[PDB]
Amino acid sequence: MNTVIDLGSKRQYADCSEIFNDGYKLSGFYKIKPLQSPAEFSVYCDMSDGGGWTVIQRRSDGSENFNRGWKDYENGFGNFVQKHGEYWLGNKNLHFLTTQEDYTLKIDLADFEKNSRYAQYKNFKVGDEKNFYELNIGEYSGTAGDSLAGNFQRMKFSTWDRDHDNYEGNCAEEDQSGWWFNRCHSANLNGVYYSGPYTAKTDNGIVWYTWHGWWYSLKSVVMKIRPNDFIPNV
Amino acid sequence: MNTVIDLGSKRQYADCSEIFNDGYKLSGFYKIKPLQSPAEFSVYCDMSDGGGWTVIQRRSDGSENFNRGWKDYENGFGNFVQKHGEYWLGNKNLHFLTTQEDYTLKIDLADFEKNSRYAQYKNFKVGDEKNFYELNIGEYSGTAGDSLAGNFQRMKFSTWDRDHDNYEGNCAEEDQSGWWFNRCHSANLNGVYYSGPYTAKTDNGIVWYTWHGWWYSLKSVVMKIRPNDFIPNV
């Protein structure tokens, strides 16, 4: 088993910011239960970087398969056991999270040359399943450049088997990821884990165009959220 | 479930002092694995009071039955789920712990009148099963008075079913506890949970004679250990 700390008491937390503000300053996996969530679920809490970040997505080493269909992107998948592993929290969980409070999205990015950048968006919100988990994002700031925005109309989430109202997957690309794609496909943090510069039939890697363009696949991603108005306790 | 923190990595710790010195300052239940222990086991770590205390016994509310035989006192029993619950760590585990390093025993005591005291003994050591888990204790200091010492020859542990080389229990007292009894029976922190002053056939309560005498049963006990030469990290 992992090192685990059993506090010997129970309290329900909506997100990692509430955990941090209750005095828990250790990064690790915790259970959270957003207001409208039918059950608690594991999430990585990044308590660095000012504290209280709920990690919604992580890439690190290429271990996990992100070529998943609508169901897996809805429910969540990946590694909720290892500190440095990879996961997708699940669109249903994103919706339950981002409707209970107004969150900032921060995206921590690293390349294969030990460089890092970040992108931050105020008011990140994910719509419900009937609305294809559509993305709303507010004001950008940071160093990575704004690759997420549909201006690069809310962007629907798509998967290989749920793409422009086709449910069968017959026009899907190889290794097609789940994302809120814009016209330029300028971001796809759920793309194929290549080792930096790459070539393939399509530009389907871990792309953040405004930093390294379409044909460079990033080394590390953490997508994480915290309330816009988060105030760290002490 | 309780609030639990999964660090997402593994490291083996011999005791709660090693956990604390590795940067974990939260009181709670952790797994430890003493050098000679065949397996890891849960223990409460009291990280207050200078840090790194491994709790070996706790009394709080009278929930658990301490009228247990040799086997249960050897293996450990009680509540390893609730912060304020009661347990006995187990004599085999005490032996594995106290032979790997030289520990100080601290005993935190409270009465029903919101008073507290403590007793501390340098070089607490518990012998092996063949030697009836015999107690060795060194220099006393504190406010509660020295009720543990056999001077009040190493004291053998006894239970109802292992008492003066009788294995059947035919001369056992009602509610007889497991302890290292001295002649005066001046301590029995494993005794019956009465509410302070009490009367019964025998003085079989949670007794620490040097503080409140034989016929007063204490409210709270924590018996905990840390290496004599423990140096807190930062």
PDB file of all heavy atoms in Angstrom, chain B residues 167-179:
ATOM      1  N   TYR B 167      -2.441 -21.501  33.459  1.00  0.00           N
ATOM      2  CA  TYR B 167      -2.893 -21.255  32.100  1.00  0.00           C
ATOM      3  C   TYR B 167      -4.403 -21.413  31.944  1.00  0.00           C
ATOM      4  O   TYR B 167      -4.898 -21.226  30.834  1.00  0.00           O
ATOM      5  CB  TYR B 167      -2.236 -22.200  31.088  1.00  0.00           C
ATOM      6  CG  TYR B 167      -0.787 -21.918  30.709  1.00  0.00           C
ATOM      7  CD1 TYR B 167       0.177 -21.665  31.677  1.00  0.00           C
ATOM      8  CD2 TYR B 167      -0.392 -21.883  29.376  1.00  0.00           C
ATOM      9  CE1 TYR B 167       1.491 -21.392  31.332  1.00  0.00           C
ATOM     10  CE2 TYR B 167       0.918 -21.617  29.016  1.00  0.00           C
ATOM     11  CZ  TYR B 167       1.856 -21.355  29.999  1.00  0.00           C
ATOM     12  OH  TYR B 167       3.156 -21.077  29.688  1.00  0.00           O
ATOM     13  N   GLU B 168      -5.133 -21.757  33.010  1.00  0.00           N
ATOM     14  CA  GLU B 168      -6.580 -22.090  32.848  1.00  0.00           C
ATOM     15  C   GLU B 168      -7.520 -20.957  33.292  1.00  0.00           C
ATOM     16  O   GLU B 168      -8.671 -20.958  32.830  1.00  0.00           O
ATOM     17  CB  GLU B 168      -6.900 -23.361  33.636  1.00  0.00           C
ATOM     18  CG  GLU B 168      -7.368 -24.517  32.759  1.00  0.00           C
ATOM     19  CD  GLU B 168      -7.436 -25.836  33.503  1.00  0.00           C
ATOM     20  OE1 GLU B 168      -8.011 -25.863  34.611  1.00  0.00           O
ATOM     21  OE2 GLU B 168      -6.911 -26.837  32.975  1.00  0.00           O
ATOM     22  N   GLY B 169      -7.076 -20.085  34.192  1.00  0.00           N
ATOM     23  CA  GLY B 169      -7.858 -18.933  34.610  1.00  0.00           C
ATOM     24  C   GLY B 169      -8.770 -19.192  35.807  1.00  0.00           C
ATOM     25  O   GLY B 169      -9.625 -18.351  36.071  1.00  0.00           O
ATOM     26  N   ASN B 170      -8.505 -20.202  36.643  1.00  0.00           N
ATOM     27  CA  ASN B 170      -9.451 -20.642  37.655  1.00  0.00           C
ATOM     28  C   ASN B 170      -9.439 -19.756  38.898  1.00  0.00           C
ATOM     29  O   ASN B 170     -10.353 -19.831  39.717  1.00  0.00           O
ATOM     30  CB  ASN B 170      -9.151 -22.029  38.213  1.00  0.00           C
ATOM     31  CG  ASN B 170      -8.162 -22.796  37.370  1.00  0.00           C
ATOM     32  OD1 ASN B 170      -6.949 -22.600  37.506  1.00  0.00           O
ATOM     33  ND2 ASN B 170      -8.665 -23.653  36.493  1.00  0.00           N
ATOM     34  N   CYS B 171      -8.376 -18.966  39.080  1.00  0.00           N
ATOM     35  CA  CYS B 171      -8.257 -18.065  40.214  1.00  0.00           C
ATOM     36  C   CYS B 171      -8.269 -16.615  39.737  1.00  0.00           C
ATOM     37  O   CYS B 171      -7.854 -15.730  40.481  1.00  0.00           O
ATOM     38  CB  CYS B 171      -6.983 -18.397  40.982  1.00  0.00           C
ATOM     39  SG  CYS B 171      -6.994 -20.043  41.741  1.00  0.00           S
ATOM     40  N   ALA B 172      -8.750 -16.360  38.515  1.00  0.00           N
ATOM     41  CA  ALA B 172      -8.851 -15.020  37.958  1.00  0.00           C
ATOM     42  C   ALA B 172      -9.927 -14.219  38.685  1.00  0.00           C
ATOM     43  O   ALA B 172     -10.913 -14.786  39.153  1.00  0.00           O
ATOM     44  CB  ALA B 172      -9.149 -15.106  36.476  1.00  0.00           C
ATOM     45  N   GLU B 173      -9.714 -12.903  38.793  1.00  0.00           N
ATOM     46  CA  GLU B 173     -10.712 -11.974  39.295  1.00  0.00           C
ATOM     47  C   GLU B 173     -11.642 -11.573  38.153  1.00  0.00           C
ATOM     48  O   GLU B 173     -11.266 -11.583  36.982  1.00  0.00           O
ATOM     49  CB  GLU B 173     -10.127 -10.673  39.845  1.00  0.00           C
ATOM     50  CG  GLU B 173      -9.023 -10.808  40.889  1.00  0.00           C
ATOM     51  CD  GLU B 173      -8.335  -9.493  41.217  1.00  0.00           C
ATOM     52  OE1 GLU B 173      -8.842  -8.411  40.849  1.00  0.00           O
ATOM     53  OE2 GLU B 173      -7.250  -9.533  41.834  1.00  0.00           O
ATOM     54  N   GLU B 174     -12.853 -11.136  38.512  1.00  0.00           N
ATOM     55  CA  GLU B 174     -13.779 -10.573  37.544  1.00  0.00           C
ATOM     56  C   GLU B 174     -13.140  -9.330  36.930  1.00  0.00           C
ATOM     57  O   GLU B 174     -12.554  -8.513  37.637  1.00  0.00           O
ATOM     58  CB  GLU B 174     -15.107 -10.233  38.221  1.00  0.00           C
ATOM     59  CG  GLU B 174     -16.314 -10.554  37.343  1.00  0.00           C
ATOM     60  CD  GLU B 174     -17.654 -10.042  37.842  1.00  0.00           C
ATOM     61  OE1 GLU B 174     -17.741  -9.464  38.947  1.00  0.00           O
ATOM     62  OE2 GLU B 174     -18.615 -10.236  37.070  1.00  0.00           O
ATOM     63  N   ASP B 175     -13.243  -9.214  35.602  1.00  0.00           N
ATOM     64  CA  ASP B 175     -12.757  -8.063  34.858  1.00  0.00           C
ATOM     65  C   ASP B 175     -11.250  -7.863  34.989  1.00  0.00           C
ATOM     66  O   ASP B 175     -10.749  -6.759  34.782  1.00  0.00           O
ATOM     67  CB  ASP B 175     -13.551  -6.825  35.242  1.00  0.00           C
ATOM     68  CG  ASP B 175     -15.003  -6.887  34.789  1.00  0.00           C
ATOM     69  OD1 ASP B 175     -15.216  -7.143  33.585  1.00  0.00           O
ATOM     70  OD2 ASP B 175     -15.887  -6.659  35.641  1.00  0.00           O
ATOM     71  N   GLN B 176     -10.521  -8.950  35.260  1.00  0.00           N
ATOM     72  CA  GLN B 176      -9.071  -8.902  35.342  1.00  0.00           C
ATOM     73  C   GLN B 176      -8.470  -8.478  34.004  1.00  0.00           C
ATOM     74  O   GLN B 176      -8.768  -9.015  32.939  1.00  0.00           O
ATOM     75  CB  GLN B 176      -8.512 -10.259  35.770  1.00  0.00           C
ATOM     76  CG  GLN B 176      -6.991 -10.319  35.858  1.00  0.00           C
ATOM     77  CD  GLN B 176      -6.489 -11.503  36.658  1.00  0.00           C
ATOM     78  OE1 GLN B 176      -7.201 -12.037  37.515  1.00  0.00           O
ATOM     79  NE2 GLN B 176      -5.250 -11.900  36.403  1.00  0.00           N
ATOM     80  N   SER B 177      -7.582  -7.483  34.097  1.00  0.00           N
ATOM     81  CA  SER B 177      -6.932  -6.863  32.955  1.00  0.00           C
ATOM     82  C   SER B 177      -5.580  -7.518  32.683  1.00  0.00           C
ATOM     83  O   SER B 177      -5.067  -8.345  33.437  1.00  0.00           O
ATOM     84  CB  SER B 177      -6.757  -5.390  33.229  1.00  0.00           C
ATOM     85  OG  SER B 177      -5.715  -5.163  34.169  1.00  0.00           O
ATOM     86  N   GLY B 178      -5.004  -7.104  31.551  1.00  0.00           N
ATOM     87  CA  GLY B 178      -3.630  -7.425  31.203  1.00  0.00           C
ATOM     88  C   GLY B 178      -2.747  -6.267  31.656  1.00  0.00           C
ATOM     89  O   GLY B 178      -3.021  -5.121  31.303  1.00  0.00           O
ATOM     90  N   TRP B 179      -1.722  -6.594  32.452  1.00  0.00           N
ATOM     91  CA  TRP B 179      -0.801  -5.572  32.919  1.00  0.00           C
ATOM     92  C   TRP B 179       0.469  -6.228  33.453  1.00  0.00           C
ATOM     93  O   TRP B 179       0.550  -7.449  33.574  1.00  0.00           O
ATOM     94  CB  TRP B 179      -1.500  -4.703  33.971  1.00  0.00           C
ATOM     95  CG  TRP B 179      -0.835  -3.387  34.280  1.00  0.00           C
ATOM     96  CD1 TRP B 179      -0.145  -3.031  35.401  1.00  0.00           C
ATOM     97  CD2 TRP B 179      -0.762  -2.240  33.404  1.00  0.00           C
ATOM     98  NE1 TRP B 179       0.381  -1.773  35.282  1.00  0.00           N
ATOM     99  CE2 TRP B 179      -0.007  -1.254  34.075  1.00  0.00           C
ATOM    100  CE3 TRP B 179      -1.267  -1.956  32.130  1.00  0.00           C
ATOM    101  CZ2 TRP B 179       0.215   0.004  33.523  1.00  0.00           C
ATOM    102  CZ3 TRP B 179      -1.042  -0.709  31.591  1.00  0.00           C
ATOM    103  CH2 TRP B 179      -0.286   0.250  32.265  1.00  0.00           C
TER     104      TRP B 179
END
